[model samples]
Target chain A: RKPIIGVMGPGKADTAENQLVMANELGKQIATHGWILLTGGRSLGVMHEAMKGAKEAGGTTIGVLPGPDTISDAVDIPIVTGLGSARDNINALSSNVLVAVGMGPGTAAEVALALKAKKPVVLLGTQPEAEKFFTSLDAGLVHVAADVAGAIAAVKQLLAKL
Target chain B: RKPIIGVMGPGKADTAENQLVMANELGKQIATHGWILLTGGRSLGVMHEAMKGAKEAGGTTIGVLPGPDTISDAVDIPIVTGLGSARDNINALSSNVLVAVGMGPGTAAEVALALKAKKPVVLLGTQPEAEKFFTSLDAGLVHVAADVAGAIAAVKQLLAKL
Candidate 1:
């Protein structure tokens, strides 16, 4: 089947102390719900923790890593590597459900691409401004969640709607 | 008019002193050509030096950071703090030309995406084994360079071809 869920978010550019909590919760939620986690992998803060949680929950994670090494001990999951950042976007766009957690310019671009593709997106840890803007846009494709749990819940609801 | 180029690689993951040199050379070479540098927007080994090189060469640098108001003061660069790793890949992909330097799983994913999109790809510091397998595929889409200069030269050539 088309990839179940495409997990897109900020990288090192948006890590936080509580990122562990955000990631852990998101990971468990995705796994318990039988959703596969997809990400830009290679041991970044929240990304790493989320992968940890998913594995703990016995779920599969697809990592779109950059570069030429396939045997690096750094990768914690079964990864499809060698696509640079620019190219990973195409792979990431293939996700059935695209979600963002505390994103940046890169995250924004993914959101833009997914929107362009008419894919549904949910944003976690988004700001008030973002929430107001997305809500008003009323595009019915863009969504915002106050936290990881809320984001997951919204995605679940949206998925059900789909 | 695509988004600017963001150069990302593992930072501080490799303790080798020479890897930093390679990364610096790559950054300088890229900046010398007047490309915008997008990075993790931090002061770690490769990320820090590459930003410095780009700045020294009078190139604009944007750091898409991860954290909540916790950016490093040492980092004088303006931080685009929004998306996390998932989005970072999007930002990196938004650029028309993305270079893979001293890569790992993260870089590999980017390369794969680039190939899938038929985008021009230039590899630097890629291991021989990795190169062999990709070239063996004979896709004619993948290209490799041994070092920084070779990578830049190949990119220029590829751009000319495009």
Candidate 2:
């Protein structure tokens, strides 16, 4: 099986153009590395953009959708969990590494779960509060990145170690 | 597999003592009907009380834990998803029917997921706004119950049709 990289971010990033662009770039990088891209499978925001980037880069994309209703068109492989937000567990647990693009209550929980599972998490230009929250839990499990290139380098470094 | 009924409600009932009591009763009744109980698996409020009720009645319980940290002693089986609040999807999707005891954003989402999955949902003394939310979607998929006994009765009716 291909190594899966889970991308956790807000369902919609309508206001944050920087975050959205970075997410797309991150997905493209993951695909370029011949890794599978996993997302929450919601058809909006960061998840959608990331999947689109991966697809355009000729990479496989899998969406562990919250429900049948929220399945994204960008997803090549859709797992219709009908699990609602609970499907985030599938997103976190199934991935080899996690990339947190932005912060929200749901995304924060995903980061917490990935950390608890001892998975390496890359924080890509996330807010200070999100950084603080994860650092408080365990600083060693999370890597901070300043930009898209930095985040991709961090992912590759962590994947090499794994 | 035995019939699985997901119970969605508040994480803490510190303010609503009566809600706690009813949740316990609902759990007991679910078990008495030879059904398995599923919850978010946090250690407080409706989920805890329902699991306690089911255990007292000698029924099996499944806790789709939000993370490994929130695993409850009340559950007979623990599915440590480490998905955080996203685990609410498992709590909704794995069940034959969903019994919503009260309203929270998490519980409301669970109810929404269940309905979207075309699963039957029983509402037990939830807020009037919650009633409105479901009624607006598909009134037939949701049944209103006055209390614990009524909730159980609704569950049985739905299960019988299945």
Candidate 3:
């Protein structure tokens, strides 16, 4: 079975223009690599952009939701957990690796949870403080990336564990 | 808002009969405290027994399932995530506290994930290795209780953060 990659970052209210494009490309490449793309399952920022890219690439996508039905158009499979932000745990634990495309409170919490799960993380254009803080905790769990391509490479390398 | 308590442990395949009663009492007490009970949402092990107790207590319960509809009768709400054992992530992340009623590979993984999420965990009649291993990771996150009332007390203390 193809591993599911949970991609998260800032939502529409605070996302940068470039981050949106990076997430789209990241989602596309993640799909092209034959991996299932999972996201926050909303109609916002990275969640939307990444799923858009994956959908365009004809990839299967899953969105773990915070509500019963606040869904994104691009999500192929919607998991309505009704846990509000606590649904981040599903996103953190379900993915083989969580690729953080931007920075925000939500994304940072997911990163923390991911590391706690002993899951690998790829930080794409997110920032330095998070990487530094998380890396300080567990150097092995965090991977900082400059762009989408590098992010995917980091994903591979993280999972490769070789 | 009422907090959610996730109860986990061994299934029918390897669970002890005494553990079942402990799980039922644990679940009942967790609900009687006015908290929501969460579980693996299956028909076996602590998942089923805990939900049964919570139901009898007239408390709300949520089950994170590994399939479409393989569910526990005691579950008031079923979240069929179709993630197999990975569904343990939800049980770990969604709850403010995770109560380990029994021990097994699945239950231990949930404990590990719960600690990673920075969630509090109360080990009820689970073995010592887990309490030791998990406590070694974060002393604050790992709590041991010899009985159901003690487990609930540990939960309140952990959340009290005093």
Candidate 4:
């Protein structure tokens, strides 16, 4: 079965430069792996870059947006819900594997929700607090990855087990 | 301003009996305060009881449903997301204060998201691990309530600050 990998990250400008670049590479990598890219439908920052890269790779992208205005320009499918931050839950639930490209408040919640749902998560350069806390919840479910390439490799590992 | 309080809880079969009862009372009490009540639009369990009690008190209740079929019969308005557990993000972001009546995986996620948004949270009768875990993340934002009455009082204290 083709999986929908939820690529989560910050939607702010002050994020890590390398992390933003990795988000794009992560999206492209996810697409090349024959998977669908899912995101929060952000207008800018990490999620936007990921979607852009996914489109460039000729991949299908779904944006589970908090609102209509939050749509990424590259999203192929926009699942608009004017529900504010609650859109993260939808993103977590719909994904086969939730991959966090970088750590942030919104990204942290999606990871937690995915864990609660017994969904496998791939963390790419998130906070130490998140890694420890989520792993403490269920260490077996959380897989730590180093970067974009590492994240896709981790995704491959999880999908094979699934 | 009439605040909208999001009351989150499990939709599972087995749950704390006292907590379930408190959820019903919590809804009734929330209505008496002239506040608008919101829930995850559950068909049964804690969320269902809470909505029933709110409607009993002649209060308007909103259910942010994961799917159309998951709505509680007592909800006055339904914000259907059809987004599964992702609807929890909406439950957290939209509320002025999030009150978790009974703890479970789904409930845990809503609380996490609320705290991440820097929104005040009133947790009534949940797991001790949850209390410790959440408090560790942001102690000041996480308030533990003894029961439904305590939860509303906590909510009152939080609203007073805003």
Go through the candidates in order and give each one's DockQ. Answer: 0.02, 0.09, 0.03, 0.02
The deviation in Å at residue B115 for candidate 1 is: 14
lDDT of 2 by residue, B25-87 (tens): 999988998898888667688889999999899887766664444356787555445445654
Q: Candidate 4 residues A1-162, lDDT tens each?
A: 257788888777667988888998998988888888878666577888888888899887766665434265697655445466744645456567889878877778778878877888988878787788889989989988877778898888888887
Task: Report the lDDT tens digits of candidate 1 across residue range B1-162.
Answer: 112454656667652556677777777776788666666666776666777777777765655454333333323333332345653444454344566666676666666666565565666566776676656654486677777788777766765665
Model 4 misplaced regions, further than 4 Å: A1-162, B86-89
**Per-residue lDDT of candidate 1, residues A1-162 (tens digit):** 213566665666566666567876787788778877776665665666677677678766655565542322222333333345663344444455677766566767777766766678887775676656655554688877778777788778877876
Docking class of 2: incorrect
Residue B33 shift from truth in candidate 4, angstroms: 0.2
Give the per-residue lDDT digits (tens) of candidate 2, residues A123-142.
88688888888988889989
What's the residue-level lDDT of A145 in candidate 3?
88
lDDT of 4 by residue, B1-162 (tens): 357788888776767788779989999998988887878666577888888888899886766666424255687555445355644645456567888877877778778877877888888878798888889989999998887778999988888887
* Candidate 4 chain B weakest ten by summed lDDT: B78-87
Greater-lDDT candidate between 2 and 3: 3
On lDDT, the leading prediction is: 3
**CAPRI verdict (incorrect, acceptable, medium, high) for model 1:** incorrect
**Residues forming the 10-long window of minimal summed lDDT in candidate 4 chain A:** A64-73
State the DockQ, from 0 to 1, for candidate 2: 0.09
TM-score of chain A of each: 0.81, 0.92, 0.94, 0.92
